[PDB]
Subunit: 311 residues, 5 copies
């Protein structure tokens, strides 16, 4: 119950491996995801080395309390993982093979700028703090890094589960810390968004544009203002459940643009009626006739500019 002694000066290499069993509860708003996986750890301790000819065992199994085990922690977790040691095996040369099954709520930030067409990289940071007698450094056993085929996140396409092999070694509170990066690449399943959000939101906007084929100010006010209410009501219905994002998103820009179009269409309706009442029906009619083409064209162009700037 002291770290293994160094054969030559060099630090202890703790070989790691994460194997995803289950991925669930991806909360976009909280920027957290819950994960259930295996953590494999391999290190050599020659104090645990033995001759198989005299000892007469394949490998010696130990209790966690019995031997020295490195303290591997996660950087980006809410609280410490719920871990359960599955097996500890010691080969004759002193190579300890540790395996545990853990569940953790991982805090990983998400970029919503290209939502719902976005893709994300979920991070899991492994960390080990070096001891007095010797430095501890992390490594990746690529054979022991993977994911269950059945691993699923509803609404996401799980691309890959890989690790950045070279650790980030640095000093923290007068000790060396070796940090590893396990990445889960996911891409969103944006299909339903079109018939479910895009298309009914666009219909409401189009209904407001019928005020360009009418001269009735009462019918026109009822058209643009009632559709503005239906727009807001629709947005309450299809609300992300996510408190507003501090940065400007593609989706956010378009919604802003739609509120601007409701305001501009009211201006038009207001102008047209005032010109008609102010004995100028030539200007009133030409503005209305222009708007019939102007409104959809400006909308289509501004939308293309936005789609281009974001993607």
């Amino acid at each position: 119950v002291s770290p293994p002694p160094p054969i030559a000066d060099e630090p202890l290499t703790v070989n790691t491996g994460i194997y995803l069993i289950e991925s669930y509860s991806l909360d976009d708003c909280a920027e957290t995801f819950k994960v259930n996986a295996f953590l494999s750890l391999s290190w050599k301790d020659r104090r645990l080395a033995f001759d198989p000819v005299r000892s007469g065992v394949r490998v010696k199994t130990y209790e966690p309390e019995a031997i020295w085990i490195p303290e591997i922690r996660f950087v980006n977790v809410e609280n410490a993982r719920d871990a359960d040691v599955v097996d500890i095996s010691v080969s004759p040369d002193g190579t300890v093979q540790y395996l545990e099954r853990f569940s953790a709520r991982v805090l990983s930030p998400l970029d919503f700028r290209r939502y719902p067409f976005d893709s994300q990289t979920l991070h899991i940071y492994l960390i080990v703090r070096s001891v007095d007698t010797r430095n501890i450094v992390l490594a990746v056993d690529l054979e022991k890094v993977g994911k269950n085929d059945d691993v699923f996140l509803t609404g996401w396409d799980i691309e890959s589960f890989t690790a950045v092999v070279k650790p980030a070694n640095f000093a923290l509170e007068d000790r060396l810390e070796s940090k590893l990066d396990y990445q889960l690449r996911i891409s969103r399943q944006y299909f339903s968004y079109i018939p479910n959000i895009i298309l009914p939101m666009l219909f409401i906007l189009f209904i407001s544009w019928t005020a360009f084929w009418s001269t009735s100010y009462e019918a026109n006010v009822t058209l643009v203002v009632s559709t503005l209410i239906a727009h807001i009501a629709f947005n309450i219905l299809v609300e992300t459940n996510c408190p507003k994002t501090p940065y400007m998103t593609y989706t956010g820009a378009i919604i802003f643009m739609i509120y601007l179009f409701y305001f501009v269409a009211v201006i038009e309706v207001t102008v047209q009626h005032y010109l008609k009442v102010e004995s100028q029906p030539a200007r009133a009619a030409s503005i209305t006739r222009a708007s019939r083409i102007a409104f959809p064209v400006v909308f289509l162009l501004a939308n293309i500019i936005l789609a281009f700037l974001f993607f």
Copy 2:
């Protein structure tokens, strides 16, 4: 507290069994359900063998700490089950009969394509990782697999609770994994859905069609747009509380179809009034008269096509 030694290299057979006591909290959105049940386990540990004559007892009872117990875990669980060992009984041959009462939040995916007429198969995967000394394989004791008659999920008809007897044995991180599939088949109780969701949503749509028995553009705009508001408001009220499904559902298709019908009815109302104002009341009136038949017929037809494509 090491696995029982093999006589002739044979793997240890752990006879399982799950008996549902309570099933509750089925969260459609989270694709999770909470379960309270019995887990029965039986295996032979000859190290515990005794002679009932010298012992004076025909069976021996042990504390979990006292003997070796296989590490049975569930694959699709949020965290490890809250288990409480009920009884451990050893017969003279050294056959252990283990029983525990556990509670677990099981992650099982759900297909909402045929909602609310859907049926689901809930899975519970039992798993055991083999040891260095010997391999461990799972088995189903069919006499120990069942459910309490009083087991209920509000709004579901619990068809059956069975297990796929042949385990899925496979290699993972250089060891054998014997996995079992326990299945809970449930079918939805969709009656209340007709008077609560379907009919009041259909009435609102029908109200919009009264604009085909009017020539008043002000009354017509008020009809189609106010009903569209009422539709959205109704949907906010009867909202599933489920963030939108990534795939297209039967329900989703119909709602989309309804939003399209609100838009088409506005087009009609817009066309009719423009023709009237453009000195063509013959065409205006014939379009309106056609819509009176067209709208319900196309709706009934498109609905049958949708019902066919989904079921």
Copy 3:
């Protein structure tokens, strides 16, 4: 420790008793309630019997670990109760007086058919599984079954806390199980419903009926459709927070009836205007005049039929 040995063939009788300290968190939607109470247990274990003269003590206190204690569990709980043993006392004849203070989330179904005029019976099922050496049977002492006077559930009148004295002994997985039914009878405090939900809901409906004292189709469309919106908006405001009930409720029937009345009133308004425009103002006016009496009378009758069928 193993169970106490019997002279009398009859199994071991464990005298139970539950005393409610606090009742809180009654979730109508989840059909769960949280409870904090005392669990009293009594049984004779002659192995513990002593001579108070030679022992020098009239009563002996033991640690739960020290003696044999029956495994009492609850059938309808989310997870096993958080229990804390308060006292264990042994009398010279070997009688054990066990007492613990527990907290549990109890799953008890609720029938909303007569909501908000309903009354409910909350169940707590005590269970004990028989050992191999001897069978174990539960008993109630209704002196030991009670509740704190200050026990409260907001919006409910806590009638009684009692137990069904005859236990339900039955075989499960080749062993006997003696089950007790503890019942908490509660009745709803429905006063607030009239001034909060029922009267404002009736007012909106009556507003729609003023369309029978008008000939203005624009004012009439605005009356029936705007009130339908206000009805839905009201229902969003006074929403039960309960996902729709799979069965037909009294409340559910009436709400359905109200949506039907909104649709029928639109039909009337539509018919009246079409007859007027189709040079038939005699029929139009007689339909409107009839509706003035028909609508409230049919509403009052249909409501009485519903109230009768449900109560």
Copy 4:
């Protein structure tokens, strides 16, 4: 680890004290509040008495496991408090001074009848169960009862933290129990309720009264019904998030009164138009003219009557 012995058949007096460190999470709907405080306990155990001369120390410090400590529990708590023993000190006469720092979610009912002008008394009930060897009685060390000056509840003025010195001793499950009442008096500081809820809710109602200065039935229907929608919509926005209170509140009475006024104003608008259309414009105009004074006067008076009946 047995209770201290009585010299002359006296019960053990446990001197208590609670010192509020933090008060937070007051949930009006759940009728719970979370508290972080110090619990001080003092009692005389002569088995711990010593001669400071021979001992060399004026005070002795012990580990909780080392000595006998009374089991103090809380009556109205969700689960048992998270406690941590800060210090245990023994003086030469054997007077024990125990101190712990605990956090608890206390269930204390709230009376909303005078909301938002209400004041509440939060209770914390201390309890001790007497033991076989001797009876245990609670006492208040008033020197050890207080609160941190920085203790705050957002939207409340924390008046006082005091205890009812005379304990409530009584029998429970054949043992005497001593109960103490700690009271936290709070008064609601919700000044912003006037500009945030009261004034916008009144403006909406006043807008409906403008239909008494109009003869246009279409404009009037649009005024009273649209404002009724805006009223409901406003109430959805400023919703307490508290499921309806079973009893009639001051706030509840006024909201009811407002819904009645919307209905009465519709009746007026309906009557006025019907009289006008039924060739009686003298009565129609006199009713409208009356309403202009009647409506605000009846509102102001009924409001005063309500304010008087509740306060």
Copy 5:
């Protein structure tokens, strides 16, 4: 397991240091934030001092149970922190280098008066209570006080993590308490508020002002009342999820001002129409013409006055 005996009058100095690893879950409404960090503690216990020649070791490692460790607690936490001792190291002179990794939900009040342009100072109060034998005083080494570069709070700019070096030593329950103030300075990311909340809410208000370029009372009622509905609906959509603040905020003042403007615009519309109908179209037209300038000018001025009073 007694405090170390000093020769010097001065109390024991415990050098503290907090290092933020993760900051998450900042709940504006609850005025709480969750934190994951390192707690470093340094003190000298001469009883631990050793000859490293005789000992053979330059540093000694101890288990928390093995040695005396000061009881460091947090003042403003929900429950005591979930701590995990990372390392304990002793040098030949008796210096203890303690390090733990803790997670805590910190209660820190927030001032919303200047929201969404606000900045906040989050507090973490460290505290140590002095023992019988000697007083214990806290110290800050600002070298050890830091934060991970990757520490983030969505929508906030984390300015600095620091500590007020001079501890607040005071008497509590006849003992000394040394308290340290750790501060996290954050400033809000208000950009998205302009296009998401400010601008669309203004557009709706402006739409209501078009009622100053119309004489149609039906169109005007529809304008002012429908926009008031859209305003409320918008506020439901962009709702903070925060129950109203007991104090008057900048945002709160403006929203109140907007509701006043909706009411004043209704008064105008009502006055205009009544003057027109009361054969005075000169006054009606001059009031309308004035409002066109008055309304935006009064709005712009009142807004500047509010912005000045709050900032």
